[PDB]
Amino acid sequence: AYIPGEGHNLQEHSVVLIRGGRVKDLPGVRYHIVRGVYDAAGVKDRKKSRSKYGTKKPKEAA
């Protein structure tokens, strides 16, 4: 199980709710990760990948 990408945490539990998809490496890659599941709420700051990369809909002060 891979990850959704940037922002590395997840000490040992996090619950990589498997999602599913291979890439041209790590023989299989199948069954990805979500973030925000029971841990790992995306990567700090985001704009579009906020459909899996946590960081809700971050609004400023203006």
Q: Which residues here bind RNA, judged by CB under 7 A?
A: 4-8, 17, 19-25, 34, 36-37, 41, 45-52, 54, 56-57
Q: Nearer to RNA by C-beta: 28 or 56?
A: 56
Minimal distance in Å, beta carbon 11 to RNA?
16
Minimal distance in Å, beta carbon 56 to RNA?
4
**Cβ neighbours of 21 (radius 10 Å):** 9
| Pairwise CA distance, residues 42 & 26, whole Å | 22
